[PDB]
């Protein structure tokens, strides 16, 4: 009855160790432009400055 | 796109277009003839000008060399318009752009020669001068009677020709 209450605590601490190692991996994972910039307007493509615009300036 | 400043030096190059590009007639019309015949070269050559700018859009940064074949045709068809308007109404076209030579090339100051020219070209060259983007129940501005903005001096030749066209009944 004491070895099982050992193993419960050790299971509950290896759960926290794996929880930390996961949450440290989750930080260095790269993130989408829709999550790490504005959600609305998910493109990085500008089309900026359109009053005297020349066709052929797009690429 | 930006203006030359701080001691710009103009230079020209005596050279020729290469062999593979065919020769093209260029427009010799000046700012008042070109601004006069602008609406009629825009009426006849809408799909050619549209083809040129649409090609230039689709081949980005290609630009110059890859839509040359179509910028041939826009210059050719506008030369066709101005040759036809010469041979049709040289006198009234001349009346219009000689009016536009004064008054800062403002189109606001030459209505009475413009009416004569628009009638003569719609009668014979059968092209009409229109303003697009203009939804109905909005009068086009070169049709209105008593505009607020009148020129300083009506030129004399077009007032006389306008009164003579009233008396002839052609107006």
């Amino acid at each position: 009855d004491i070895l099982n209450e050992e193993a419960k605590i050790v299971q509950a601490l290896n759960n926290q160790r794996e929880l930390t190692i996961k949450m440290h991996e989750l930080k260095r994972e790269e993130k989408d432009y829709a999550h790490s910039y504005s959600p609305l307007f998910s493109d990085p493509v500008p089309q900026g400055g359109s009053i005297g615009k020349a066709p052929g300036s797009s690429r | 796109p930006r203006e030359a400043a701080a001691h710009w030096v103009p230079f020209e190059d005596k050279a020729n277009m290469p062999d593979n590009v065919p020769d093209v007639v260029e427009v010799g019309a000046t700012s008042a003839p070109l601004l006069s015949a602008s609406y009629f070269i825009g009426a006849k050559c809408k799909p050619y000008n549209d083809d040129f700018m649409l090609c230039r859009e689709e081949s980005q940064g290609s630009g110059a060399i890859d839509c040359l074949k179509e910028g041939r045709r826009v210059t050719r068809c506008a030369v066709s318009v101005i040759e036809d308007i010469n041979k049709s109404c040289l006198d009234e076209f001349r009346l219009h752009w000689q009016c536009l030579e004064q008054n800062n090339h403002q189109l606001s100051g030459c209505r009475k020669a413009e009416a004569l020219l628009n009638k003569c070209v719609f009668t014979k060259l059968n092209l009409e001068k229109k303003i697009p983007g203009l939804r109905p129940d909005e009068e086009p501005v070169f049709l209105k009677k008593d505009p607020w903005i009148k020129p300083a001096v009506d030129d004399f030749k077009s007032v006389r020709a306008y009164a003579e066209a009233k008396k002839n009944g052609t107006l």
Side-chain angles (χ1 to χ4, degrees), chain A:
Chain A
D1 292 330
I2 305 176
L3 293 179
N4 291 319
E5 295 179 352
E6 301 301 317
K8 288 178 185 179
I9 298 171
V10 172
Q11 183 66 42
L13 294 173
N14 290 322
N15 288 323
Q16 181 67 42
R17 184 179 180 275
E18 293 178 355
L19 191 280
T20 57
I21 295 167
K22 286 177 186 177
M23 296 303 298
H24 291 296
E25 291 176 356
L26 267 73
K27 294 174 96 292
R28 286 91 174 91
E29 182 176 1
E30 293 294 328
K31 193 185 282 185
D32 291 330
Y33 182 79
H35 296 279
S36 66
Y37 183 78
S38 70
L40 185 63
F41 293 99
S42 66
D43 60 351
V45 175
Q47 60 181 2
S50 61
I51 184 167
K53 64 179 178 183
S57 296
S58 295
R59 295 176 183 271

Side-chain angles (χ1 to χ4, degrees), chain B residues 118-134:
Chain B
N118 289 323
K119 183 68 180 295
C120 193
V121 176
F122 182 75
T123 300
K124 293 186 290 298
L125 185 55
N126 66 12
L127 295 171
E128 187 178 358
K129 177 173 178 272
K130 298 295 289 182
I131 296 172
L134 182 65

Side-chain angles (χ1 to χ4, degrees), chain A residues 54-59, chain B residues 53 56-57 59-61:
Chain A
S57 296
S58 295
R59 295 176 183 271
Chain B
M53 299 300 287
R56 186 176 172 88
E57 191 272 332
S59 68
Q60 70 285 0

